[PDB]
Homo-oligomer: A and B are copies of this chain.
Amino acid sequence: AEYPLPKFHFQVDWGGSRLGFTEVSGLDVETEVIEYREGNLPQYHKLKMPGMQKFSNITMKRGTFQGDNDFYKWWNTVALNTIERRDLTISLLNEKHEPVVVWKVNRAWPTKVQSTDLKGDGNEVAIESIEVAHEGLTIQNG
């Protein structure tokens, strides 16, 4: 309550079987600026007012396990213009595992899935990524 929070203890509800994600990025909101000026205004710069909103895609990365094929499962539910949409919840936890900051996403479906690359000299774990589109985002703190 008095200390600033760290950024390494979180969880994601995505209607998937397993949990334990490595990276989650892309949480933004924006509004466009509209500008205006008429000829007789004594200042020689413009006036500004709000416009339309814009939201970003969300990226998630996790490690690969035997028997788990969930990213592909969700991506592959796509017909011509129909797909299975889900509600997404992201929460940041503190030392006593209590949800402190919550991000609520609306109508999210997977737009991209990327698998790992194979290197004969690579001493690292295999990681996979998913990219998701949505129609809304909301922040709740305290």
Q: How large is the interface on A (under 10, 10 to 19, 20 to 34, 35 or more residues)?
A: 35 or more
Which A residues have a C-beta under 8 Å from some C-beta of B?
Answer: 1-12, 19-34, 36-55, 62-69, 72, 75, 78-83, 90, 92-95, 97, 100-101, 103, 107, 109, 111-126, 133-136, 139-142
Inter-chain CA distance A46–B52, complex, in Å, is 9
Q: Which residues of chain B are within 8 angstroms of A80 by Cβ–Cβ distance?
A: 6, 9, 44, 50, 94-95
Contact A66 B123 (CB under 8 A): no
The answer to whether A120 and B21 touch (CB under 8 A), given A6-B51, A33-B111, is yes
Q: Which of B4, B27, B31, B139 lies in contact with A69, CB distance below 8 A?
A: B139
Q: Which of B41, B92, B93, B111 lies in contact with A30, CB distance below 8 A?
A: B111
Contact B111 A3 (CB under 8 A): no
Q: Which of B27, B43, B72, B125 lies in contact with A34, CB distance below 8 A?
A: B125
- A7-B124, A50-B83 provided; 5 other pairs, C-beta below 8 A? A3-B36, A5-B81, A5-B125, A34-B123, A38-B62
Q: Which of B5, B11, B140 lies in contact with A40, CB distance below 8 A?
A: B11
Residue among A6, A43, A100 having the largest count of chain B Cβ atoms under 10 Å: A6
